[PDB]
Amino acid sequence: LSNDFFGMEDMDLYDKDSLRYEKFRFMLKMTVRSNKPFRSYDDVTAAVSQWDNSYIGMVGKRPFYKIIALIGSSHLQATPAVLADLNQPEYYATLTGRCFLPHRLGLIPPMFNVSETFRKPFNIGIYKGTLDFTFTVSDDESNEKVPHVWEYMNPKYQSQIQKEGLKFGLILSKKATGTWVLDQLSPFK
Amino acid sequence: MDLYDKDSLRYEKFRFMLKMTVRSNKPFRSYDDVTAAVSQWDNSYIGMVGKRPFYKIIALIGSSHLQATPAVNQPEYYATLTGRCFLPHRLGLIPPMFNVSETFRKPFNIGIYKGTLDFTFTVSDDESNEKVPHVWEYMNPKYQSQIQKEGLKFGLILSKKATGTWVLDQLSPFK
Amino acid sequence: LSNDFFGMEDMDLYDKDSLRYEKFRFMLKMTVRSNKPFRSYDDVTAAVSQWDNSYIGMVGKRPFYKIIALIGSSHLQATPAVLADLNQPEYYATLTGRCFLPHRLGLIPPMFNVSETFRKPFNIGIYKGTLDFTFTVSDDESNEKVPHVWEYMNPKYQSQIQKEGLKFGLILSKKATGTWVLDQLSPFK
Amino acid sequence: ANEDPVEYPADYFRKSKEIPLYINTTKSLSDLRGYVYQGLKSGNVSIIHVNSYLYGALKDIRGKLDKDWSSFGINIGKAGDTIGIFDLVSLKALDGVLPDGVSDASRTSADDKWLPLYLLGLYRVGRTQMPEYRKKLMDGLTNQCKMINEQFEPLVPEGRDIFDVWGNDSNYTKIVAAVDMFFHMFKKHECASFRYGTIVSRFKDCAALATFGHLCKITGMSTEDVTTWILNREVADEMVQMMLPGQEIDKADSYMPYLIDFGLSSKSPYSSVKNPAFHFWGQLTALLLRSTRARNARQPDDIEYTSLTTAGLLYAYAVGSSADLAQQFCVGDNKYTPPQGRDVVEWPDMMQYAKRAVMSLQGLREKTIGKYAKSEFDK
Amino acid sequence: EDPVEYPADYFRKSKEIPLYINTTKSLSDLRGYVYQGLKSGNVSIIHVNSYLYGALKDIRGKLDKDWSSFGINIGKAGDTIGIFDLVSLKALDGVLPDGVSDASRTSADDKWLPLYLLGLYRVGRTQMPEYRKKLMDGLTNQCKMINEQFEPLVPEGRDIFDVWGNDSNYTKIVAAVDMFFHMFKKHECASFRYGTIVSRFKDCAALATFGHLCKITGMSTEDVTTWILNREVADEMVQMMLPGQEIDKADSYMPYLIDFGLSSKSPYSSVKNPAFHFWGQLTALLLRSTRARNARQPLTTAGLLYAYAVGSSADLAQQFCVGDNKYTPDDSTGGLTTNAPPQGRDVVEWLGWFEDMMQYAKRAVMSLQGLREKTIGKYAKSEFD
Amino acid sequence: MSVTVKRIIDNTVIVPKLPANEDPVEYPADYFRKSKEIPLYINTTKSLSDLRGYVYQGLKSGNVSIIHVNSYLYGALKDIRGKLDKDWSSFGINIGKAGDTIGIFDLVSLKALDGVLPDGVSDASRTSADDKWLPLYLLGLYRVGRTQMPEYRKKLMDGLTNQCKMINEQFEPLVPEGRDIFDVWGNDSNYTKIVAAVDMFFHMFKKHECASFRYGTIVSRFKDCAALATFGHLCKITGMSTEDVTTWILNREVADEMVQMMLPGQEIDKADSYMPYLIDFGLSSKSPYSSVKNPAFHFWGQLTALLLRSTRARNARQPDDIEYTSLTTAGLLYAYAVGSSADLAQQFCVGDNKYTPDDSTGGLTTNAPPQGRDVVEWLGWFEDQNRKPTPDMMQYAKRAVMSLQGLREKTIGKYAKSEFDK
């Protein structure tokens, strides 16, 4: 910061963290395979948060990809193979809609309707396996009202969201208005 | 060595937040096992380096204040601590901290016990002029040989100044 | 030194031991063959410390190669052949990831993504056998925060890293915060 | 006004005293390296990102000037001060939106060795429009890059060429021409291999001047004497528009050879489309004197052919049948002595000479000088 | 005839290939379903599709290179990929048949039962009892190579598997399996290529005979297209070679353009490309090719001219030289005006010569013992002998 | 494409392209650029004795699993013995360095197989006398399971039995007379990787005390490289320098076949390299040096070698769907050039005595054989003979193909006797 070196005056367009809403529609496909069923959402988040260990996909959508992974992990419904002993359990989750996310990560570069797939393994100790993703995060220049991004996660899961979001790298801060805002990501992510 | 308090005692006050969560294969037997399971929380420390000693003392207070959930399938422990306090430490100047939370999880392999951990640490600076309580009464310790030894194998090192104020000496992980 | 001869003033870039952090990803493979199983980890350090008796490898990675050898010796898990009486006990260990090593060895030359194998028999008296190595130490310009290098050793072993880490020729010290900074290698080595 | 009026570099430098370079620099070098790298593999790299990365990776202030490098009244450097690539073009900030980017975080700092060279080579590659020359240029580029990196897995896919549009972006052409001229000034630079893929920017859209020089070099006739042979009554105006005084077209280390890539001139007067008759005459004359260069140049259209062929045949016969053989160096004394000369005023056998010159050529070229001569002077 | 549909048009319309299956059943219940259906000859197509999906979820198989095709991001060189990772998966909105579910069948299905189900797909496409019996015997040998008991499930008759090809989902599954095992030839389950190899280049006999012609004439594809004549073979070839169809890439969606449903009418088919198929097969037969003896007859002058041009006028031209010394003596009485074959392969020169072949056709066709009805061999024996 | 193609009704391009009926060639260099190691997936979660019992009882009962045999072969072939004398760098891979002992699997990367391990037929009465002869037998079945015909497989089995009996001397045969299971072992990738690694390791160390294991794995050497092998055989039978031979190839498909055959960055001239195992190691799924991918050169070279009276070129299978006129004419011309007009030129000289008499009536223009080996001069003679081979060439072919009793069906000898013996 300014205490370290000389002459790092910030731009006056956005001072430091000027809040703004980024309208955007999205699409998601997700498939998590594990050797044992996930006892709680804790292990689910632990296994999923390693999807971007080696990030090759589009970088201008990385926070949005993180939040879409968060909603996918929230909505991981099981399959008949997740029963007692049939095969390796294989979870599945798809979500499609439009939402606006208040964030302070700076002006986001324009997005395009391009699909991105991710395939990385995970090893959180007790559990092992791979993942699967299909993001379609693109800008929405229309003016139709959209539901809030945090509304899509039902409160039945996520006993408290302020840390479930952090598990995937997000940084949240409740404005006491009821609309969570994404402050930044994990260090240098 | 420096003339102006190189490695002398330093009083640092902070605002913290803790959400302890420990899981094990079968219920814990002794507090030594609890310490052994917790101490492997920073096998791959990614968060801020300057906040490491404070994080270890917060993990220590979480270990001291661990109560099992009423459900105890697998034993799922839980704890949550928050308070205002100051730390006397001999680690020199520390970088300023911020009001940001950092996540933690490492599966502990202490032999008999299998499980994982889940931390929620929000240690932040506090420049308020209000007098703040000491960290060491948040415990439930025995001042004779317990708090100096229960937290010792977390890497913490304590000393005697004859005043009764436990001052942090040095952090000694895997040593 | 300056007490001996005339005009060996130090440079103004790094005074004597200007501490610096060198972020770097790595990879490691290990294979230790022996006539008898290693009773204690100290014997393992003794058998591996001479892995560079005749050194052909890298200079800018030689301290890094030593620390990688130390981390491999720390995690030298046994094999089913190590059981009562099947064959000679063959050990194996592999580690991959990224880390930053605080050291006072001066500026390091830019490292490349190149692998070098190492082979050398060892004779620590009672124990015979050879070694095997494959390092992939190289720079990492990404801002991605990395775990501390000395953290990669589990606290289960190495009751005193000040000497267990010194068995390989390193000279350790403590930064008065709980982070170990590499002073230098064995003197004149 | 079917063809735009010719613009001279002197007019541009009188209008503006600097060459702007609008780029976006609000990105770290590693971020832009990953951007362009993953775009090259994905075949969807943006021009803004590649220009920004090219600026960020070619800031080599190394290169010590030995002599003054003034050109068009520009104090580029003064005989001893270290100079970089972009100290010869004015740099500004681009106003626009920066695309997302696909940056890879695992890309180390091994880019300056070979990646700018590849990115500049794709500029020269993206002008052939024909599979054979494009494939051989790709082979040469891979050979050049493997000489430095030695791994070089090709980035751009085999199909779906996205680098043909890069030439239509003014900023990319400015960067590539600046790199070319900087490495032309410093031949023995350690990064001189970057010249591959940007030499096409040297004397670009100046084939008429190139064929004039070739004519002056193949006949051995003085460049001041060759211009006396201008005929046909349209070559005269062409040659006059070629040699306007204040252009420094004879200066190698000048801004002239990049009058179109730097944006100095929109329509280069020295181009072949704007100079059809002179190019046709010079190339035909060079072919009639057995020059391997003058068998691939395109035969210009919309110009009369008979008079140019007659003039070229006359000059070729003058060169080939009238050797000079005149005393030129004297030791104190002993100086003195078809028209058997090369003077312009002095000047079936000519068709016989043309037939002798044009026969025995294998594999002619469509629409070029060689095939036209074979169909015209080989009856 | 339906207009030709190209795979590029479909992939422009949609960015994925949907696979509609009903997966609301356990894998064991489905193995019992399909086993008892096959033994009783009363297995449903929905049940067999669901079981085929359930027993072929082998994520194993590590890609070594990028596998892009038609702008579809299949994989990147190192990430493990499954059979169904290259087709989009959906949920079938339909009724699930009751079934004959069993319980005594252990977990011995992934070894040989998908092999049986995919092989019967190829079996139910012949309609020659002898060829069908031979294919069934080969299928039995292939399955017995894995489990070694393999009592045949489908009875001697009762070809319920004939209708299996009508269902789009079954064809999509079998073609996806063929693509996956063609990409991974050395897979441990590569035996499944039996029965699904028929999906490869299905309904594309015109392209196959084009390749056969280019392989049998020695001339490049660049030069064979110069010899097209008759003004229907010409635009036939033009419509065959649309640029963005990606027909020269092996690991692409093109060969399964009809099983994946990418095209309703395959442009490279025989009923839509009759004349070029006939011409190529006739020429290949005149060039002594055993393959050009059985294709159904859907030009003869052009084929005979090309066959005489390529089978008599051998090239024998210098093509590798040591630096220099390359040419041929053109001054050694190199005449070109005679009543003899041009001794070359150029199309224009042979056309000028046209502006002995009976005997050449006779010797290329006679003694062609063992011909079959509607085949090009019978046509050539009746016409060119 | 080569150049553009125009159909003249509207001046439009067609740009034809061959269908992907056969997979394109793959070079080992591309694979080694993609990956810097050769993975080998095995299941090592078993003891050596247990795996030995597994494989022994499976072979005796004819139901041995591929995972068990692969794991046992890894366990019994961990012989680090074998001291390198020189460097063994190949395709940018440092196997060893001039003095360090290396093992069989030190040249292939080792991983852990992801799968379930079969139960097995574990036995405990079999002692540790396995490394002497059991890997030999297990590798010999790999070569045995490629004949696909009993009258050769029986000889191979007898040879393997003798090879193992020379070491163990009891060796009751394990696999029954029928009921083959080793036919499938070729399909598995890890088994091929292990067998090829063993073959190359014992090829580098010929004088090893366990070099007998080369039996049963020698077939992996230059596997599916029939075109390269026949090119070498042709270069060795014609006696001409290997570079002048390639100047003689004709018919316009042999040239492009050759170009794809010897792309420079393939390292096909180094014996201790990964190239001969491009398909067993998985370096290439479709070997460019195979005969199915290279039919024309294989056919032409085999025919030429047969016309030069070579015993090797009488059993090579005649490729299908290729020209049998132009290639045969070119091969006959080559054979008449080399086997009739011997070069026979002065080679070494002592200071002087070099040249040949060119003034002693050295006429050239005649209706006689060129009496040389230059491709251009023989080609000029042939085109002066209007590309119609002389009856003397027919007589030479008849002399070189006659008396060839006991030919093999579908092979080159049968075609030559049916064609050049009218």
XYZ file of N, CA, C and O in Angstrom, chain D residues 12 16 19 27 34 49 69 81 134 145-146 166 170 205 227 238 246 260 269 280 289 300 347:
92
model
N 2.587 13.462 -43.292
C 2.148 12.987 -41.983
C 2.998 13.591 -40.873
O 2.474 14.037 -39.846
N 1.492 15.617 -37.820
C 1.708 15.168 -36.452
C 3.188 14.885 -36.234
O 3.865 14.355 -37.120
N 4.097 9.317 -33.516
C 3.300 8.174 -33.952
C 2.641 7.573 -32.714
O 3.323 6.889 -31.933
N -3.241 -4.380 -16.892
C -3.156 -5.816 -16.663
C -1.700 -6.178 -16.414
O -0.804 -5.606 -17.041
N -0.900 -15.212 -19.979
C -1.882 -16.284 -19.934
C -3.053 -16.029 -20.862
O -3.533 -16.942 -21.543
N -5.642 -7.801 -26.266
C -4.794 -8.563 -25.356
C -3.437 -8.866 -25.977
O -2.409 -8.775 -25.297
N 20.403 8.516 -34.599
C 19.317 7.825 -35.286
C 18.158 8.780 -35.541
O 16.991 8.468 -35.302
N 23.121 6.455 -25.726
C 22.077 6.202 -24.743
C 21.323 4.933 -25.119
O 20.946 4.751 -26.282
N 2.094 -20.486 -46.962
C 1.697 -20.444 -45.559
C 2.265 -21.628 -44.786
O 2.758 -21.468 -43.664
N 11.286 -20.991 -33.531
C 10.886 -21.019 -32.128
C 11.522 -22.189 -31.387
O 11.951 -22.044 -30.237
N 11.586 -23.360 -32.027
C 12.201 -24.521 -31.391
C 13.690 -24.306 -31.160
O 14.289 -24.974 -30.310
N -5.494 -9.800 -37.908
C -4.542 -9.020 -37.121
C -3.892 -7.918 -37.950
O -3.594 -6.836 -37.433
N -4.524 -1.393 -36.785
C -3.421 -0.456 -36.975
C -2.370 -0.594 -35.881
O -1.166 -0.520 -36.154
N 4.278 -2.764 -49.219
C 3.560 -1.967 -50.215
C 4.498 -0.983 -50.907
O 4.152 0.174 -51.155
N 17.098 6.453 -65.115
C 15.923 7.314 -65.195
C 15.875 8.135 -66.477
O 14.818 8.691 -66.792
N 5.102 8.862 -63.063
C 5.280 7.831 -62.047
C 6.615 7.993 -61.328
O 6.676 7.999 -60.092
N 11.813 15.390 -50.212
C 11.745 15.215 -48.774
C 11.063 13.945 -48.307
O 10.025 14.008 -47.644
N 3.305 2.666 -44.280
C 1.950 2.148 -44.238
C 1.647 1.405 -42.940
O 0.507 1.462 -42.462
N 2.616 5.803 -52.131
C 2.915 6.116 -53.537
C 3.828 5.102 -54.201
O 3.765 4.930 -55.424
N 5.731 -2.976 -64.281
C 5.698 -3.866 -65.436
C 6.952 -3.709 -66.287
O 7.596 -4.700 -66.656
N 16.861 -9.940 -69.073
C 18.281 -10.047 -68.769
C 18.603 -11.237 -67.872
O 19.643 -11.232 -67.203
N 0.655 -6.225 -64.001
C -0.370 -5.232 -63.661
C -1.433 -5.118 -64.742
O -1.186 -5.372 -65.923
N 20.900 4.808 -78.417
C 19.942 3.745 -78.689
C 18.581 4.279 -79.112
O 17.880 3.606 -79.875
